[PDB]
Ligand binder design. Structure first.
Ligand SMILES: [Mg+2]
Ligand SMILES: [Mg+2]
Ligand SMILES: [Mg+2]
Ligand SMILES: [Mg+2]
Ligand SMILES: [Mg+2]
Ligand SMILES: [Mg+2]
Length: 191
RNA sequence: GGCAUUGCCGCGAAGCUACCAUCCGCUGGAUUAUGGCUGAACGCCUCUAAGUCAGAAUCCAUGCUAGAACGCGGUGAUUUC
């Protein structure tokens, strides 16, 4: 249909500064600085009042306007990650063999090490992406917590941990063992 | 010692040679299917549309062979008459 103009609003809270040169977005907040290259989308950013950015697509087709809202969501996630942070809680699930998850170092590289998954003698190692913090939750049995500014990095680190523990050659409806994301929220409570 | 078209027999070094002998046969990246992340379209959802993770005896490299006889480089010496 080639809609004349489509636009989305990105709300900027008080303690956040958004610097957008051509299509490289830098978001600065209390928790840190995030950066995203969006030169692949052909959108136009415009600051309105220092609390509102508008992102627009002119003469855009269906896919172009579909990507506009994706741009808005990505910038919103950047802002949410520098203000509230992102935290993913994963639970270990096993029928018989306890899963042994720890943090080890290889040349100072901070791997999540998984042993005894379904009795395996193989040691699985999932690197920790920079910016992601791993904390093992006390008062909850078999819970690993991944926290960070970038939802992309924390969710991909959690997904790597989940994927490393896929069951092979078994009915997965029965052999349900693995490390599964049980919660995805923010670092700051009740916000 | 000759001849017997290598006269025949045993052993027989060298050379050649046998899964009949011994040794040796490399590790990186990009991918497929697929499973995912974020994420709209479609206020939800969604691996997909933008972006993106992993991933096959695959592919391209590393490695190995040849070296273009009209591809190239470096370097030595270049004729007293
Ligand atoms: Mg079976
Ligand atoms: Mg005679
Ligand atoms: Mg004779
Ligand atoms: Mg999701
Ligand atoms: Mg795509
Ligand atoms: Mg030649």
């Amino acid at each position: 249909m080639k809609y004349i103009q489509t636009e989305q609003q990105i709300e900027v809270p008080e303690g956040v500064t958004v610097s957008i040169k051509s299509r490289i977005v830098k978001v600065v907040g209390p928790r840190g600085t995030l950066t995203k290259n969006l030169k692949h989308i052909d959108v136009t950013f415009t600051k309105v009042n220092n609390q509102l950015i508008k992102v627009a697509v002119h003469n855009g087709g269906r896919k172009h306007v579909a990507a506009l809202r994706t741009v808005k969501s990505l910038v919103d996630n950047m802002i949410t990650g520098v203000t509230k942070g992102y935290k993913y809680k994963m639970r270990y699930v096993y029928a018989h063999f306890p899963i042994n998850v720890n943090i080890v170092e290889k040349d100072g590289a901070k791997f999540i090490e998984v042993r005894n998954f379904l009795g395996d003698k193989k040691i699985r190692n999932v690197p920790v992406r920079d910016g992601v913090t791993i904390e093992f939750s006390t008062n909850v049995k078999d819970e690993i917590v991944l926290s960070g500014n970038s939802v992309e990095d924390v969710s991909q680190n959690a997904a790597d941990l989940q994927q490393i523990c896929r069951v092979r050659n078994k009915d997965i409806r029965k052999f349900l063992d693995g490390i599964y994301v049980s919660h995805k929220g923010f670092i700051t409570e009740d916000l």
